[PDB]
Amino acid sequence: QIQLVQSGPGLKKPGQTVKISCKASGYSFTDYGMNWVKQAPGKGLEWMGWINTSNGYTTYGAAFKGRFSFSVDNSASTAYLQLSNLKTADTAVYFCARSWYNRAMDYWGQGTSVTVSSAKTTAPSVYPLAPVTGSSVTLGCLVKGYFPEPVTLTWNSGSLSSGVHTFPAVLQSDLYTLSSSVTVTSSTWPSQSITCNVAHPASSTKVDKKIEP
Amino acid sequence: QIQLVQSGPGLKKPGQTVKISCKASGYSFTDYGMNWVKQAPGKGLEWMGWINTSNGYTTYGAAFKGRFSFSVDNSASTAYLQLSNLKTADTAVYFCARSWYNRAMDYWGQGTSVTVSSAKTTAPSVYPLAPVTGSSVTLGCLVKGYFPEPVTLTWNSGSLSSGVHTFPAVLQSDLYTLSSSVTVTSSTWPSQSITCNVAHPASSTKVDKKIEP
Amino acid sequence: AVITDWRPEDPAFWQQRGQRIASRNLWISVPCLLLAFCVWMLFSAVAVNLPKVGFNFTTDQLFMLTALPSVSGALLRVPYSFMVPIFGGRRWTAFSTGILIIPCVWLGFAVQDTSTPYSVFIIISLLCGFAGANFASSMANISFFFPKQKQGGALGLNGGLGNMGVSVMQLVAPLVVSLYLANASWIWVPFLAIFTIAAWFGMNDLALWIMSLLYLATFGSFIGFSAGFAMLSKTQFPDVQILQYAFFGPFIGALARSAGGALSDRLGGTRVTLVNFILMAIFSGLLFLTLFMAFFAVFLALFLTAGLGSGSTFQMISVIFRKLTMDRVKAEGGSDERAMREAATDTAAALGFISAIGAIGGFFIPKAFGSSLALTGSPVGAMKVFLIFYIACVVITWAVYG
Amino acid sequence: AVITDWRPEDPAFWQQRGQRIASRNLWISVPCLLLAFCVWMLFSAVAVNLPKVGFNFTTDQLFMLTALPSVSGALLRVPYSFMVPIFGGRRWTAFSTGILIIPCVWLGFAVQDTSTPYSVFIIISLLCGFAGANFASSMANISFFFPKQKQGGALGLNGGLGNMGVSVMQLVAPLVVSYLANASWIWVPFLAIFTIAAWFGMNDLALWIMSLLYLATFGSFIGFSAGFAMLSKTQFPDVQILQYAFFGPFIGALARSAGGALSDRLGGTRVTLVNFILMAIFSGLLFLTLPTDGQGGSFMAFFAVFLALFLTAGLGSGSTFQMISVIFRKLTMDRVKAEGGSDERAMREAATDTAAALGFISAIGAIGGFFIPKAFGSSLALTGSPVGAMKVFLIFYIACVVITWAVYG
Amino acid sequence: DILMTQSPSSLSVSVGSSVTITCQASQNITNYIVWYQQKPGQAPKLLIYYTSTLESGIPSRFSGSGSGRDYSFTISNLQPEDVATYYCLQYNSLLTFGGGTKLEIKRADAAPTVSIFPPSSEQLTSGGASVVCFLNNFYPKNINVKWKIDGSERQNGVLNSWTDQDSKDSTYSMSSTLTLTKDEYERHNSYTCEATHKTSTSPIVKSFNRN
Amino acid sequence: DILMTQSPSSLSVSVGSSVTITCQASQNITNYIVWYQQKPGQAPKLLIYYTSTLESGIPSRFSGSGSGRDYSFTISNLQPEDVATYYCLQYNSLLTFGGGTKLEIKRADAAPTVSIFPPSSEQLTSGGASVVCFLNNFYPKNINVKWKIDGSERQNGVLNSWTDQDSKDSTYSMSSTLTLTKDEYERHNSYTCEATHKTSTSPIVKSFNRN
Ligand SMILES: CO[C@H]1O[C@H](CO)[C@@H](O)[C@H](O)[C@H]1O
Ligand SMILES: CO[C@H]1O[C@H](CO)[C@@H](O)[C@H](O)[C@H]1O
Ligand SMILES: O=N[O-]
Ligand SMILES: O=N[O-]
């Protein structure tokens, strides 16, 4: 099992610095270069550069010359991308991927979302949505007024994962709102309870909401 | 002023249903009947029937009793054709035209092409064709392996309209292929750029290919 | 304007466009027709006021000008019924309405000049009779626009509201004469022009002797009494201005024509026509015993009896043709539909002739009142010839139908 | 195993990937090449022990079995050089080492049976000459793996510890005899091991006069390697040469390395020239150590003079290589300068040319591993003396002094 | 149902010439006939209704006449715009279209101007190779096109397409395209496209070699 | 730097059909091309390295080819899992990504199943009111949602959201939420959510009354 696992999402203000990490395992670290790919929202993949794991020499693409630094920690078997004097333009998901050379970027990290904003971080309001008649009913969950991404939302803590549609969050007036539906058969509700779990790491919130008739 | 504008082309499989529509404007909809005309590929015009715009009552010609339905929506000022349980034999351009009686079928829709087929929908490959005699050179564009029709092709977005010949698609092993040629003076190519723009709606493709020496 | 595809017997066509076009045509035909009646009966209200502005005409020279419209009126009805199929409904209705501006202007001028010859005043009354023929053409036109089973109500509407033109004039022309006599003629030149333009743009062009005599006894009477009544209720009661009351006569007459057929199809065409000629004899006699209230009410009943009579003679004719074509068709061995459509075509084609004979009484009745009052000093002379006639008419009804 | 992206001239690639992969390939290469030098020279130590187990072949027929490997060896050197870009370093190395187990088992059986014909023994010797060609394929392989400006050290290592195989065998084959099967079968476990090792460990990437000068130097090292134990038996039958013969080819190999290193310190042609004087002087002094039938002569002197002739032959091998190397760098320098290019292009191209030339130069050069012990056969079988052969050698090394002065210094 | 026969079903006529199409009904259709023009890809235009009445806008050159079962339609001074398929229709009882009359214009014979095009490298990566020949602006329509690969003739793999007669200059253009595998294409060297037209007995030849 | 252009930028193709993405480099890249698959939210997967060598695990249906400047990539028997954005990349001199190809699968048209939800009483306390409408499992993506309050259409305060195509049944689901002040909400009585889809000319209407 070869894997590269990346640091979690970060929110920063214009002017500050982030530093993302990437832990490689399942293979001998210093035998492969490490690449960094940028993906701005709704753009395609951008190659930033690579770092040579056997000598620590970085190599930057014309566009990433100045505020970007790749660095290594061979014993930790991990690489880092440091971004300095952040601009709104640095808002993106950032990948680390392994190998410049034979099978270029043959394994990727899971990606790391960086939001460059001034918006204040706020918790979400989690509203349960109950019906106002087939053999199946649909319940919903409205998750309003939070910033930044991500919120994550499950049903009965994961147990109810089929019948679900979680809709991509939409930002407005510096606040995201999201929602999610579950449809189940009528035999199963209200007979058994269905409950909406909402985590919002950025504000350290965990709210549950039982859907009431 | 007076105009009937029909819906766009549709691909469907044997057994399925289609509904074409026709929007009349610049006259008083209920004053005139609506005729429906079939044109199978290569054959001539065939009258299906008409619908009475003050009754909503339909009248079907012999060969169109069973799977065909004309309906009306007086407020949308529009009428509709509805073929169901589609067969290969239903492949045709379909026409709505105005008036049973005085000046029978005095204005026509632009027609609507229904293709019945089991073939898979595939996007076209677009190949630039550059020369290998006089003061004028001819360029070309090859458009291969797409289904269904229509593709639509222009040169420099329709700025090059003289010297253009576009050759009707020919079907072979469930895939159409098409081509187009433009003749311009030698003084203007490669001097100015000449580029071919293909749109294949049934697969949401838009490809531009620039003709290079 | 030109219609090449006309199919009223086709309910589909009717619904899709027939009814819409026939309706618009009817609504413009109708006002055009009543205006023709207004112009036709002009001297019925003008000849009375001719002396009040300084004209030395015999009361019989006046009766003549009130009679002569129905001369050219009657003679032009047969050629007018041939006019629609030749020129077309929109063209004929425009033209035949338009040209009525000629007489309506001429006698608006002639009435102000105190020394205008009687020769000129004759010419104008004969031109006024052109307006009388409009009814024949208008009615044939309508018969073409409506399916041969809906024709009743449309023809009923066209002719009914058409006949109401005389009544309309005699309410208006006296009232307008204030704000003198030119206005009895000139108030119609804006209206006639309005509806010549209205027809010209709004309308479309398509691609028994005994019965005549009975219609003559009914309609000829209505139109006879319409012209002669004011001109008689003057030489008999010169103390009362009749023109403030005359209109109510033809109004009650015309409205009686509507209920005439509706009555008759409920208790027999020949019966009503028979029993109505009993009343048109009784009322023709009870007039001798008034030579004002009673003179007016008996004459108000003589318009009323002339109304029913007209509406009852029509449905009598209608039934005659419907009985005949039924028998012919059953001998050929076709369908009742054919029989219906043909009856409706036969009564409509016969109408141009029946309404010409019937229009001759609008000349006789006032000219008779003219000669009776010029030879003797009484109306009793001609009025005796009336009573005889309605007896001869009630006798020809029984003998030939009952 | 397959390598699609190979960029040794790119230091960045070298440091991330190249060096690790080229270095692992080199280290597995060496054993597989010295083992091919062991198997190549089997009869140099087996033909001596042939009669000592009951084989009545002419001593000329014994010299023949010692000479024939270099026939097929020389002739398979040109086609083997074309085999690496075709099948690949991993596969060909595995194959060309593995198939050496055939002639190794086959003369482990043939030697135990006493009635086995000469016909069979000629075949086994010719199939041993396949091992001789391993050099040219192994050497092409290495030239692909290493960057042009680093090939020297690796190539030097590959053929340096490669040539050592002759010496290593001669030290083992007598010592393992405790009989004559063991001098052949002790290599089957070793050949197999490094065939498996090559198969799993290695990787698949995606002037006539110089032939003569190499022939005079390397051909001599490899010639005297074939028929010295054999010669020091038809001269001094009472001394146990096997326990001393190994030291000859050992010095020869070490001399090969110091050959080039010496040569770029005081001239390519100069060393070649002076060392052909030595190779002539030592060819003459061999005359004065021979006993005539029989037997009045000196052995210590004979052996020391031959020890000199192995040292001198090695020295020359190195000396001739760096002459070739140098000549190609002068040619490529001049051509590029005329094309108006960079010295880097000239360096690279000279490295390719000497590597392309090497298959042919080493083919001609290997022909002398036949003539030498054949000449010692046709000297003995005719005049009953080695004096006839050595007379030819002396004339040749004189000719090589001449043909080097005239054409170079 | 009232059937309509139309005559002729097609014809070529000179510029400035006179066309007559006739239409016969199986029964009396009582003057209820319409004539439509149908240029391809566009949608029909109504020229004449009720036998003889031109629709507004429609030029004087068009007219028609007839009665009972027999009707006819005429274009009097043919222009190149008038290229289309014409149709009678009966709208007496129900509606029935005639079979059509595709009308061609004649013109001075024209020779094709010919262009050959080698496979694009973008196509070459797919593993297919098409050679395309364009023969432009010729008259009359009929034309043959021969494919030579290294002098040897090729029939398998050819696909041909022709335009509708051009409404301005009355000409045709056709496109012939020959499809091989990248292999078959790569083996041979010279590719030849021969246009044989009724404008000369010796063909127009175009070619290239892959070099 | 070596530029990479990718065709097409996006496309929709039938199950069991065949895709061909092409890539043209601005100069020769000597076969050093890789192809990636990128499902949203997950991280790219390497499909092909060195023009045409499949990564291990990657199924047969995938392949590529080409040389010099011109390269292509093909999925041969399209499957619902294949829904993603694909990428060429050159790793000859430095590295360059292509622009992407957002691949959409086509499937049998499907009507949205729709359901409306009134503002929760918990939200009412805030002074805001959201009416939320879910239209699930429809195809194709395009769909218009109209908001009616007591017959009158509402345009301001609406906010819409769409899933990525579902990699199992190829469907979409969208989420429309109409947001008002509690006042506005309390004033009217009937709220209507109307889904107009390609699958029927008359809209799917869901609604509720405040009682
Ligand atoms: C010839 O008939 C005429 O005479 C009688 C009176 O005798 C009138 O009633 C009738 O209207 C008139 O036309
Ligand atoms: C033709 O060359 C041959 O003969 C000379 C002696 O003449 C030997 O030294 C040499 O090894 C051999 O290859
Ligand atoms: O004017 N009626 O006969
Ligand atoms: O084995 N050296 O040529």
JSON list of N, CA, C and O in Angstrom, two decimals, chain E residues 120-123 125, chain F residues 22-25 27 29 31 33 51 65-72:
[
{"chain": "E", "resi": 120, "resn": "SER", "atom": "N", "xyz": [-4.04, 13.82, -42.09]},
{"chain": "E", "resi": 120, "resn": "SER", "atom": "CA", "xyz": [-3.48, 14.63, -41.02]},
{"chain": "E", "resi": 120, "resn": "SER", "atom": "C", "xyz": [-2.75, 13.73, -40.01]},
{"chain": "E", "resi": 120, "resn": "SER", "atom": "O", "xyz": [-3.14, 12.57, -39.80]},
{"chain": "E", "resi": 121, "resn": "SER", "atom": "N", "xyz": [-1.70, 14.25, -39.40]},
{"chain": "E", "resi": 121, "resn": "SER", "atom": "CA", "xyz": [-0.96, 13.50, -38.40]},
{"chain": "E", "resi": 121, "resn": "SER", "atom": "C", "xyz": [-1.83, 13.23, -37.16]},
{"chain": "E", "resi": 121, "resn": "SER", "atom": "O", "xyz": [-1.74, 12.16, -36.55]},
{"chain": "E", "resi": 122, "resn": "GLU", "atom": "N", "xyz": [-2.69, 14.20, -36.83]},
{"chain": "E", "resi": 122, "resn": "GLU", "atom": "CA", "xyz": [-3.72, 14.02, -35.80]},
{"chain": "E", "resi": 122, "resn": "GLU", "atom": "C", "xyz": [-4.59, 12.78, -36.06]},
{"chain": "E", "resi": 122, "resn": "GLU", "atom": "O", "xyz": [-4.94, 12.06, -35.14]},
{"chain": "E", "resi": 123, "resn": "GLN", "atom": "N", "xyz": [-4.92, 12.53, -37.33]},
{"chain": "E", "resi": 123, "resn": "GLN", "atom": "CA", "xyz": [-5.64, 11.31, -37.67]},
{"chain": "E", "resi": 123, "resn": "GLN", "atom": "C", "xyz": [-4.74, 10.09, -37.61]},
{"chain": "E", "resi": 123, "resn": "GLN", "atom": "O", "xyz": [-5.18, 9.01, -37.19]},
{"chain": "E", "resi": 125, "resn": "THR", "atom": "N", "xyz": [-2.48, 9.19, -35.63]},
{"chain": "E", "resi": 125, "resn": "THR", "atom": "CA", "xyz": [-2.34, 8.62, -34.29]},
{"chain": "E", "resi": 125, "resn": "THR", "atom": "C", "xyz": [-3.47, 7.64, -33.95]},
{"chain": "E", "resi": 125, "resn": "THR", "atom": "O", "xyz": [-3.25, 6.70, -33.19]},
{"chain": "F", "resi": 22, "resn": "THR", "atom": "N", "xyz": [-7.80, 14.00, -27.88]},
{"chain": "F", "resi": 22, "resn": "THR", "atom": "CA", "xyz": [-6.48, 14.22, -28.49]},
{"chain": "F", "resi": 22, "resn": "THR", "atom": "C", "xyz": [-5.69, 15.34, -27.82]},
{"chain": "F", "resi": 22, "resn": "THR", "atom": "O", "xyz": [-6.26, 16.21, -27.17]},
{"chain": "F", "resi": 23, "resn": "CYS", "atom": "N", "xyz": [-4.38, 15.31, -27.99]},
{"chain": "F", "resi": 23, "resn": "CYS", "atom": "CA", "xyz": [-3.50, 16.24, -27.33]},
{"chain": "F", "resi": 23, "resn": "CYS", "atom": "C", "xyz": [-2.41, 16.63, -28.34]},
{"chain": "F", "resi": 23, "resn": "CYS", "atom": "O", "xyz": [-1.77, 15.75, -28.93]},
{"chain": "F", "resi": 24, "resn": "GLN", "atom": "N", "xyz": [-2.24, 17.92, -28.59]},
{"chain": "F", "resi": 24, "resn": "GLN", "atom": "CA", "xyz": [-1.17, 18.35, -29.47]},
{"chain": "F", "resi": 24, "resn": "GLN", "atom": "C", "xyz": [-0.16, 19.22, -28.73]},
{"chain": "F", "resi": 24, "resn": "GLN", "atom": "O", "xyz": [-0.50, 20.31, -28.26]},
{"chain": "F", "resi": 25, "resn": "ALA", "atom": "N", "xyz": [1.08, 18.75, -28.65]},
{"chain": "F", "resi": 25, "resn": "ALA", "atom": "CA", "xyz": [2.13, 19.52, -28.00]},
{"chain": "F", "resi": 25, "resn": "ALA", "atom": "C", "xyz": [2.71, 20.55, -28.96]},
{"chain": "F", "resi": 25, "resn": "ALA", "atom": "O", "xyz": [2.71, 20.33, -30.17]},
{"chain": "F", "resi": 27, "resn": "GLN", "atom": "N", "xyz": [5.76, 21.39, -29.22]},
{"chain": "F", "resi": 27, "resn": "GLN", "atom": "CA", "xyz": [6.92, 20.76, -29.85]},
{"chain": "F", "resi": 27, "resn": "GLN", "atom": "C", "xyz": [7.00, 19.29, -29.48]},
{"chain": "F", "resi": 27, "resn": "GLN", "atom": "O", "xyz": [6.16, 18.79, -28.74]},
{"chain": "F", "resi": 29, "resn": "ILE", "atom": "N", "xyz": [7.73, 15.82, -27.86]},
{"chain": "F", "resi": 29, "resn": "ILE", "atom": "CA", "xyz": [7.85, 15.42, -26.46]},
{"chain": "F", "resi": 29, "resn": "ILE", "atom": "C", "xyz": [8.33, 13.97, -26.36]},
{"chain": "F", "resi": 29, "resn": "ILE", "atom": "O", "xyz": [8.31, 13.35, -25.29]},
{"chain": "F", "resi": 31, "resn": "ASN", "atom": "N", "xyz": [7.42, 10.98, -26.85]},
{"chain": "F", "resi": 31, "resn": "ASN", "atom": "CA", "xyz": [6.60, 9.92, -26.26]},
{"chain": "F", "resi": 31, "resn": "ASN", "atom": "C", "xyz": [6.32, 10.06, -24.77]},
{"chain": "F", "resi": 31, "resn": "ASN", "atom": "O", "xyz": [5.55, 9.27, -24.19]},
{"chain": "F", "resi": 33, "resn": "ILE", "atom": "N", "xyz": [4.33, 11.20, -22.49]},
{"chain": "F", "resi": 33, "resn": "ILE", "atom": "CA", "xyz": [2.98, 11.70, -22.19]},
{"chain": "F", "resi": 33, "resn": "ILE", "atom": "C", "xyz": [2.29, 10.77, -21.18]},
{"chain": "F", "resi": 33, "resn": "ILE", "atom": "O", "xyz": [2.43, 9.54, -21.24]},
{"chain": "F", "resi": 51, "resn": "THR", "atom": "N", "xyz": [3.11, 7.44, -23.53]},
{"chain": "F", "resi": 51, "resn": "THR", "atom": "CA", "xyz": [2.25, 7.34, -24.69]},
{"chain": "F", "resi": 51, "resn": "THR", "atom": "C", "xyz": [1.17, 6.28, -24.56]},
{"chain": "F", "resi": 51, "resn": "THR", "atom": "O", "xyz": [0.00, 6.57, -24.81]},
{"chain": "F", "resi": 65, "resn": "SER", "atom": "N", "xyz": [-1.98, 6.44, -27.79]},
{"chain": "F", "resi": 65, "resn": "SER", "atom": "CA", "xyz": [-0.90, 6.28, -28.77]},
{"chain": "F", "resi": 65, "resn": "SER", "atom": "C", "xyz": [-0.49, 7.63, -29.35]},
{"chain": "F", "resi": 65, "resn": "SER", "atom": "O", "xyz": [-1.05, 8.66, -28.99]},
{"chain": "F", "resi": 66, "resn": "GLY", "atom": "N", "xyz": [0.53, 7.61, -30.21]},
{"chain": "F", "resi": 66, "resn": "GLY", "atom": "CA", "xyz": [1.04, 8.82, -30.85]},
{"chain": "F", "resi": 66, "resn": "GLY", "atom": "C", "xyz": [2.55, 8.94, -30.76]},
{"chain": "F", "resi": 66, "resn": "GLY", "atom": "O", "xyz": [3.24, 8.04, -30.23]},
{"chain": "F", "resi": 67, "resn": "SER", "atom": "N", "xyz": [3.07, 10.04, -31.29]},
{"chain": "F", "resi": 67, "resn": "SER", "atom": "CA", "xyz": [4.50, 10.35, -31.26]},
{"chain": "F", "resi": 67, "resn": "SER", "atom": "C", "xyz": [4.71, 11.84, -31.59]},
{"chain": "F", "resi": 67, "resn": "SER", "atom": "O", "xyz": [3.77, 12.55, -31.95]},
{"chain": "F", "resi": 68, "resn": "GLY", "atom": "N", "xyz": [5.95, 12.30, -31.46]},
{"chain": "F", "resi": 68, "resn": "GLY", "atom": "CA", "xyz": [6.29, 13.68, -31.81]},
{"chain": "F", "resi": 68, "resn": "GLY", "atom": "C", "xyz": [5.43, 14.66, -31.05]},
{"chain": "F", "resi": 68, "resn": "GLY", "atom": "O", "xyz": [5.48, 14.72, -29.81]},
{"chain": "F", "resi": 69, "resn": "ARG", "atom": "N", "xyz": [4.64, 15.42, -31.81]},
{"chain": "F", "resi": 69, "resn": "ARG", "atom": "CA", "xyz": [3.70, 16.39, -31.25]},
{"chain": "F", "resi": 69, "resn": "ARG", "atom": "C", "xyz": [2.29, 15.82, -30.98]},
{"chain": "F", "resi": 69, "resn": "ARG", "atom": "O", "xyz": [1.58, 16.32, -30.10]},
{"chain": "F", "resi": 70, "resn": "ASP", "atom": "N", "xyz": [1.89, 14.78, -31.71]},
{"chain": "F", "resi": 70, "resn": "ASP", "atom": "CA", "xyz": [0.48, 14.38, -31.72]},
{"chain": "F", "resi": 70, "resn": "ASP", "atom": "C", "xyz": [0.18, 13.06, -31.03]},
{"chain": "F", "resi": 70, "resn": "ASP", "atom": "O", "xyz": [0.73, 12.01, -31.39]},
{"chain": "F", "resi": 71, "resn": "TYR", "atom": "N", "xyz": [-0.73, 13.12, -30.05]},
{"chain": "F", "resi": 71, "resn": "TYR", "atom": "CA", "xyz": [-1.04, 11.98, -29.18]},
{"chain": "F", "resi": 71, "resn": "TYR", "atom": "C", "xyz": [-2.54, 11.88, -28.95]},
{"chain": "F", "resi": 71, "resn": "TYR", "atom": "O", "xyz": [-3.24, 12.90, -28.99]},
{"chain": "F", "resi": 72, "resn": "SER", "atom": "N", "xyz": [-3.04, 10.67, -28.70]},
{"chain": "F", "resi": 72, "resn": "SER", "atom": "CA", "xyz": [-4.45, 10.50, -28.35]},
{"chain": "F", "resi": 72, "resn": "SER", "atom": "C", "xyz": [-4.69, 9.38, -27.33]},
{"chain": "F", "resi": 72, "resn": "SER", "atom": "O", "xyz": [-3.82, 8.55, -27.09]}
]
